Amino acid sequence: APSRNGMILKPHFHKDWQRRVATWFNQPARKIRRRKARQARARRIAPRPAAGPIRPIVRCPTVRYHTKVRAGRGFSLEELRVAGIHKKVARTIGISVDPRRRNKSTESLQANVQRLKEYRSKLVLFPRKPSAPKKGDSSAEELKLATQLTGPVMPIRN
Amino acid sequence: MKFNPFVTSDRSKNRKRHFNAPSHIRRKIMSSPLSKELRQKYNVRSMPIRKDDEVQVVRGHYKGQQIGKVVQVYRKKYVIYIERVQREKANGTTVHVGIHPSKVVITRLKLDKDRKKILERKAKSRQVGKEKGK
Amino acid sequence: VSELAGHQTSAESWGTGRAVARIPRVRGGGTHRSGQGAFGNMCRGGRMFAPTKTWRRWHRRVNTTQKRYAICSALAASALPALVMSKGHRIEEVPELPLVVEDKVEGYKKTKEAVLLLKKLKAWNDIKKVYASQRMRAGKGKMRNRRRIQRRGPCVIYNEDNGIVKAFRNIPGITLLNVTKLNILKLAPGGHVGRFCIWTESAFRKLDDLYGTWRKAASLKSNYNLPMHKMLNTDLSRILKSPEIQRALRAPRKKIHRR
RNA sequence: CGCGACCUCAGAUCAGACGUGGCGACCCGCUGAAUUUAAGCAUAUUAGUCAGCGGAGGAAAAGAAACUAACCAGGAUUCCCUCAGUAACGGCGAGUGAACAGGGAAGAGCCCAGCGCCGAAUCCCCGCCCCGCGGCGGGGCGCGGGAAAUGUGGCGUACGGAAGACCCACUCCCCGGCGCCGCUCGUGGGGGGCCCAAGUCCUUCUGAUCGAGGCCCAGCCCGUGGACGGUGUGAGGCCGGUAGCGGCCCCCGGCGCGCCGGGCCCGGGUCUUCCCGGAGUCGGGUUGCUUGGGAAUGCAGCCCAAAGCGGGUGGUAAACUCCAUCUAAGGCUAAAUACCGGCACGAGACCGAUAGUCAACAAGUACCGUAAGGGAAAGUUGAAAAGAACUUUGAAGAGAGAGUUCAAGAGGGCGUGAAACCGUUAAGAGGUAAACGGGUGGGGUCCGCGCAGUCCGCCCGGAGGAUUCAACCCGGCGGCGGCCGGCCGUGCCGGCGGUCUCGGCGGAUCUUUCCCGCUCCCGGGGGCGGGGG
RNA sequence: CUAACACGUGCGCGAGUCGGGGGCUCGCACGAAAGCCGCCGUGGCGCAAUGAAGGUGAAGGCCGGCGUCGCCGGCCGAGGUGGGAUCCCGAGGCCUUCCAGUCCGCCGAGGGCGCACCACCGGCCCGUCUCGCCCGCCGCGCCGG
RNA sequence: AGCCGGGCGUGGAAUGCGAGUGCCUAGUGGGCCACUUUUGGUAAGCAGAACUGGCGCUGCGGGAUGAACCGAACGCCGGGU
RNA sequence: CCCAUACCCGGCCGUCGCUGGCAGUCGGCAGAGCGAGAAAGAGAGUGGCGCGGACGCUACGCCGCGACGAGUAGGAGGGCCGCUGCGGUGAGCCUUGAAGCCUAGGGCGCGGGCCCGGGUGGAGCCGCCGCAGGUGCAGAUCUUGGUGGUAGUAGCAAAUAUUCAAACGAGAACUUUGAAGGCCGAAGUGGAGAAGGGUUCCAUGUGAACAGCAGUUGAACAUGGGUCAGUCGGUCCUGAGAGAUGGGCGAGCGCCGUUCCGAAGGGACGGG
RNA sequence: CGACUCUUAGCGGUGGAUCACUCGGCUCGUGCGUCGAUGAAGAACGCAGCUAGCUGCGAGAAUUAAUGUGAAUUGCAGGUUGAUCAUCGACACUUCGAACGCACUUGCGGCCCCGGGUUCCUCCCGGGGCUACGCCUGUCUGAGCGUCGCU
Ligand SMILES: [Mg+2]
Ligand SMILES: [Mg+2]
Ligand SMILES: [Mg+2]
Ligand SMILES: [Mg+2]
Ligand SMILES: [Mg+2]
Ligand SMILES: [Mg+2]
Ligand SMILES: [Mg+2]
Ligand SMILES: [Mg+2]
Ligand SMILES: [Mg+2]
Ligand SMILES: [Mg+2]
Ligand SMILES: [Mg+2]
Ligand SMILES: [Mg+2]
Ligand SMILES: [Mg+2]
Ligand SMILES: [Mg+2]
Ligand SMILES: [Mg+2]
Ligand SMILES: [Mg+2]
Ligand SMILES: [Mg+2]
Ligand SMILES: [Mg+2]
Ligand SMILES: [Mg+2]
Ligand SMILES: [Mg+2]
Ligand SMILES: [Mg+2]
Ligand SMILES: [Mg+2]
Ligand SMILES: [Mg+2]
Ligand SMILES: [Mg+2]
Ligand SMILES: [Mg+2]
Ligand SMILES: [Mg+2]
Ligand SMILES: [Mg+2]
Ligand SMILES: [Mg+2]
Ligand SMILES: [Mg+2]
Ligand SMILES: [Mg+2]
Ligand SMILES: [Mg+2]
Ligand SMILES: [Mg+2]
Ligand SMILES: [Mg+2]
Ligand SMILES: [Mg+2]
Ligand SMILES: [Mg+2]
Ligand SMILES: [Mg+2]
Ligand SMILES: [Mg+2]
Ligand SMILES: [Mg+2]
Ligand SMILES: [Mg+2]
Ligand SMILES: [Mg+2]
Ligand SMILES: [Mg+2]
Ligand SMILES: [Mg+2]
Ligand SMILES: [Mg+2]
Ligand SMILES: [Mg+2]
Ligand SMILES: [Mg+2]
Ligand SMILES: [Mg+2]
Ligand SMILES: [Mg+2]
Ligand SMILES: [Mg+2]
Ligand SMILES: [Mg+2]
Ligand SMILES: [Mg+2]
Ligand SMILES: [Mg+2]
Ligand SMILES: [Mg+2]
Ligand SMILES: [Mg+2]
Ligand SMILES: [Mg+2]
Ligand SMILES: [Mg+2]
Ligand SMILES: [Mg+2]
Ligand SMILES: [Mg+2]
């Protein structure tokens, strides 16, 4: 029954809510396990970036956020083709690729092309056979200074 | 302080393990220190007790300077019996009184091949530990 | 308690008649536990009143600024001899209670070196007090792995771990803390302020970078500064016994006028 | 009629395989209430919940758009925060109630049918030979058998693909066996086994010490070990252990290296020519259920029933008209996520035998019911049985002596041993039931360790006795104050100020003197990103 | 006991505030704690209201330039009345041998500036009604102000 | 009618007393009795109203006894009335 | 003349008010006041020996004046009231005796309660500053367990009936033997089975518990024994009926159906 | 005075409270995450020198082998080339039970191969191995006035 004055409330506890209750007592253990798995994978992929493949520049698709810039799912085929990267080789050399994304404009396409060219200029590629290098490869002296980098590769800035 | 997460410090768990340890863990548990001469000779501090080692009783109503040969080791009751420690009951028959090995010191050991193997292993491990500690 | 404790049975009240107290009773059977009263907090066996639930609000959150304020207050109070002594620590021989030693002790490796250092710094009396205080806990906490209790000893604040922790680990009552990760729970044992602390030179140097000065913000924290003083000159004795305030006072009426 | 194919369908204790049932905490597919709320009650709500049925795994399910959006656009699934108790539904009452975007955890993409091209180029099984065979595989030989053209394999799938020509690149990848070396995250993977410091030191309590005191000047000894447990109370140093990138032994794995054998002949760009898709399905009507989905969100039955610049979606029904975005009716796919069952562990501001699981114990036991099913009570001698020899009365139970023990004031349901209730002893009292409040009196048990009554200064007088007062000297220490230096300021002013830079941090202040890279322009002009001043 | 809401109280910061989710910290006796993130403040609440919606969206007061000013400048700046704790001023007034003559402090008629808060009168923003005229242009209109 | 400015204090009946204002809020929503007034009823310790005071929530002295009558309301005590 | 808890005077407790007073403990470096009817300076200035003096003030403290004190439902405050556990702290207590329990002992507090002495007991416990709660019982025809009066009472009364002697034995109304008198009266209180019971059967022994008195006795307890089949039954047949396959239905575990929508014979004289 | 009743205390009963103990629970977290026709889960019956229950085990029956360990188990007896414990990879594992020859009384069969009678000539006795349903691939034997081809 209503008291003198107050707010009308509609608590959503008319079901058997006490049977479906999610306590969070395993939150620190979950964080510890996720960390351990993260470092385990980082050790597993020895010189490769810990974060993963590079990703592209995208604009948020809304009037509320279209002024901001995200990290996308993957580079699209138009950008790869105009940057001279094969769609199959990009994935195995570290470029995230998706075929769904289109390119309505040219500024975003050119920005991502610049990103891919910078990534090619920056990455160090190990020999396919440790004894004999190949033409499309990096020379031996800079292999000694190849290290994992933390965080996303070439982080997105607004 | 214990840091190993896989070994417990719970009182009830420890007591349960102690009171239901199997016989080959009972042998380990009922160990008693060696005398000073034996300790200096073998570079070993403690030894599980055997059937016919002799003993000095250090604590209890029967403490004294009498060397006594163990007659048998009752592992179920966590007790050893010494041929001299004993008391007479009502009818006059004499029964052995139980003494815990922890309150017991060996005068000299029964040198069996397994015993000397154990002694040499203990001495070697202790010596390598000390050398590492150097 | 278990979610189904006390409800494992199947019982119905006999109802009006039978000259019984109208409570659910274990139904049927040739057993002592038959027609005995199953549910309800008043029955033997049966359910508790308002069973405790695992989703009680066990944890609390405190503002980061408030945590930093508490840490700063504890650190400031640790530097006053009166408060440290009132905490019970024996420091009458300590040469200077903001005790600072060089970074050489940061590389100690053996407990004997740590004990010798404490003896030299005359803090061994606190350790002896801890040894004397080691006793047996009272109550049911004994059978719950809280068998032994003892007094808190001094804290040691370091900057790098180079065997420092191993060296002072075994001495009872000593609490080791990194200078970059202090916690109030160990800085002010009990909620009482003024624990005896021993600093290293590097930690003492890093303190004002950690918490900033009055005119310089903290470099290691994003944006933090020391809390502002509500009153600066807290010498009430002066504030009364100064001429400029004593001048503007009426004469003190101090003659009693009894009935 | 007979003989022979193929089709369709039978029979087998034919050769070789596979399924059933259980558990079911978590998961998937169905079916599916009424208590209750609405202060009545039928729609609603409870609730797509309980109960019922089926089917799995170590996770399951979902999943690479017939998507979201309308923006300068995002881009598989799953999970958390937020959107949000919002849009919306609702006798518009009670109540119910999502999604997109945004930030994160994780992150992985692929394959057929069809369309076509390759002498079916494909697959299964039997016999012999060679290899190892405890996850029945590899190679060869069989005018061995069968499947399959009513279509097996290679290329190939919406991100286009194929073929031909021309340029460029142009070969080590995988598998079946064998051996070798080293390494294995925090510590070198996992598992198992065996070991590694220091007092029973000197006195003293005790029934028993793990108690109390001491152990010099190395403040007993160890300590990377002062967690815990046991041992006749209370133990870092008696014992097991504990700490330790400590030691030794055995077994299994993963990663690299080498050898033999087997398969594999493979790519990129430009130009020319061809080809390209899933039907009783979509969609429409109606009915019923469901959803926040409202002129119908989703599912299903029935009836109608397609098209190829087509079809679906664009949250109000309809016609016209442009736009936007996907490509349905075929398939696979780890991680983040869930876990009151199971195995093995760790812990706790929890309970402490009427509590905590029903169950600390021969507990789902005894016992009840024809059955479905219901379901208890019950821990503690003592450090050690040392568990009371022996004498005596009695038929015996049961006693008196004696004895063990620190204690039988612990005697086998024996730690402690309360109350209700009872026996006896002592004291007192008694015909208005007893008990009670206020005020005294009387008698008692104990207490004051009462029973010649307090102490404390300052004097006066008398009997004594001291290494004795004041004042000085020497040395030290402290307090207070005024000259020399020093430190600090939650104060100010200046300097040509500062490791090379002539310090750092920050700035929504500038930089045709700046420099570098990128793009546009025919070595040159302009813009953008970074560095410099 | 949990969740929600309201109000009162205590603390921190303050036009801001808050890491609750995640991550970094050699994971791990305590510690499943504690610290840190700042280009992890996404986001929540607050800083703006009103209208069903399309939408709109929170002062103005004086002088010189054409009072019977069109209209540019010079300015000044977020009202007014009453009551208002405190503060400012201050006619006068606070003593002793007298007398001249000060300093410092207290008193005090009246008079000021008036906090918060209350009441009242104006003003501004959004919806709606009545009246009436004027102005702007890339598209002079069922336009906009 | 509203505005400004100015002048008038013998504070214009007695008596008594500090006042104003704002939040949050429990219990209650069966009443009964008495003098006086009063409706229905033959009447009632009946039923129904108005004013005031009580009882309920309240003990104390008196009415022998007593929810309401008369006196008087209460911390633990001594004296007086 | 008598007396109420009313009134007057006094003491004490508490509450409320004065939003009362006290930092002035200003000392041989000093001068001891701000109670006194009258708003405000014991005002500052310039000219005509003996070394000495109580308490205080946990300011959340101490001190002084007045008034007042009923209370159900209900509201609020303070508890150096109490229980359990946690973080601090008491160089706390304790086998030269902790917890708990008992007491005609000594006391404190308005009270919640508490502190000592004595006894029993045998291993842990408490004070203070904080934190947390499964935190205080006279009742609920409360739950479980225990114990009373009733009360040595109701009662040990359905079916005619027992007596003598001996033996055993501690012990005899109840056992055993002998004798006598009785009953069942062949539709039995007799002799055998089915169902059900499951060792109750038999021998020996015991007399703790049970057999509502007792027992030398027992269907009690304790040791041992005991059920022999071609022909006696089961086993086979089918009855009323039950129930697979084929088939049908069913979301499904499954259900219907028993000759019905079935290629339903695995047999045989003989001959080759 | 005596009895009875009442009150208080001492002692003794009755009872089992309180306190102190705890090889038990409850809750949270971690790693793993595995049954079955090669016969599961469950049930029954048996197995110890003295053994009823609990526990363990399966006619090899409180356990065999193997490995580790190294002198016991124990309530009483008896007797290092390895006692006892632990681990567990070899072996074994009665009757029911999805339960499988048919049925559920443990009743009744059928086929094949061995040992007793025989000296296979058949019965009879004992032993061993098969004999469930559905379904897949292949094999064999078939059926059809189903579609055909030669005579
Ligand atoms: Mg209410
Ligand atoms: Mg270790
Ligand atoms: Mg319970
Ligand atoms: Mg206690
Ligand atoms: Mg109702
Ligand atoms: Mg109803
Ligand atoms: Mg309904
Ligand atoms: Mg529904
Ligand atoms: Mg269910
Ligand atoms: Mg199944
Ligand atoms: Mg499985
Ligand atoms: Mg899956
Ligand atoms: Mg696709
Ligand atoms: Mg999405
Ligand atoms: Mg909101
Ligand atoms: Mg309505
Ligand atoms: Mg719903
Ligand atoms: Mg989203
Ligand atoms: Mg990420
Ligand atoms: Mg094909
Ligand atoms: Mg000692
Ligand atoms: Mg040791
Ligand atoms: Mg619905
Ligand atoms: Mg529309
Ligand atoms: Mg498709
Ligand atoms: Mg698909
Ligand atoms: Mg799938
Ligand atoms: Mg832990
Ligand atoms: Mg108890
Ligand atoms: Mg007991
Ligand atoms: Mg005793
Ligand atoms: Mg007892
Ligand atoms: Mg008497
Ligand atoms: Mg309210
Ligand atoms: Mg009336
Ligand atoms: Mg009243
Ligand atoms: Mg009254
Ligand atoms: Mg009368
Ligand atoms: Mg009087
Ligand atoms: Mg008075
Ligand atoms: Mg009162
Ligand atoms: Mg008493
Ligand atoms: Mg004890
Ligand atoms: Mg509790
Ligand atoms: Mg009671
Ligand atoms: Mg009688
Ligand atoms: Mg008969
Ligand atoms: Mg007979
Ligand atoms: Mg008989
Ligand atoms: Mg009898
Ligand atoms: Mg015969
Ligand atoms: Mg049937
Ligand atoms: Mg008595
Ligand atoms: Mg047996
Ligand atoms: Mg063996
Ligand atoms: Mg062996
Ligand atoms: Mg039969």
mmCIF file of C-alpha atoms (C1' of nucleotides) in Angstrom, chain A residues 7 9 27-28 31-32 34-35 38-39 64-65 157-158, chain E residues 3-5 21-25 27 32 39 42-44:
data_model
loop_
_atom_site.group_PDB
_atom_site.id
_atom_site.type_symbol
_atom_site.label_atom_id
_atom_site.label_comp_id
_atom_site.label_asym_id
_atom_site.label_seq_id
_atom_site.Cartn_x
_atom_site.Cartn_y
_atom_site.Cartn_z
ATOM 1 C CA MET A 7 7.566 7.086 -6.241
ATOM 2 C CA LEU A 9 7.830 1.397 -8.331
ATOM 3 C CA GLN A 27 35.567 -12.817 -10.900
ATOM 4 C CA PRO A 28 39.193 -12.622 -9.635
ATOM 5 C CA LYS A 31 40.688 -12.583 -14.421
ATOM 6 C CA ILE A 32 43.681 -14.674 -13.334
ATOM 7 C CA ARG A 34 42.314 -15.047 -18.667
ATOM 8 C CA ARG A 35 45.671 -13.508 -17.882
ATOM 9 C CA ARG A 38 46.941 -14.472 -22.558
ATOM 10 C CA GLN A 39 50.581 -14.857 -21.538
ATOM 11 C CA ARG A 64 26.031 10.062 -32.346
ATOM 12 C CA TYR A 65 29.512 8.810 -33.126
ATOM 13 C CA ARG A 157 44.259 7.813 -32.559
ATOM 14 C CA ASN A 158 41.591 10.494 -32.997
ATOM 15 C "C1'" A E 3 16.753 -4.840 -4.988
ATOM 16 C "C1'" A E 4 14.292 -0.133 -5.643
ATOM 17 C "C1'" C E 5 12.819 4.637 -3.900
ATOM 18 C "C1'" G E 21 33.384 -3.941 -16.368
ATOM 19 C "C1'" G E 22 38.283 -4.737 -18.466
ATOM 20 C "C1'" G E 23 43.548 -4.467 -18.379
ATOM 21 C "C1'" C E 24 48.863 -3.817 -16.170
ATOM 22 C "C1'" U E 25 51.231 -5.376 -11.873
ATOM 23 C "C1'" G E 27 49.399 -14.691 -9.870
ATOM 24 C "C1'" A E 32 39.919 -14.217 -4.001
ATOM 25 C "C1'" C E 39 44.010 8.731 -25.196
ATOM 26 C "C1'" U E 42 32.907 3.978 -23.269
ATOM 27 C "C1'" G E 43 28.989 4.992 -19.955
ATOM 28 C "C1'" G E 44 25.680 6.601 -15.764
#
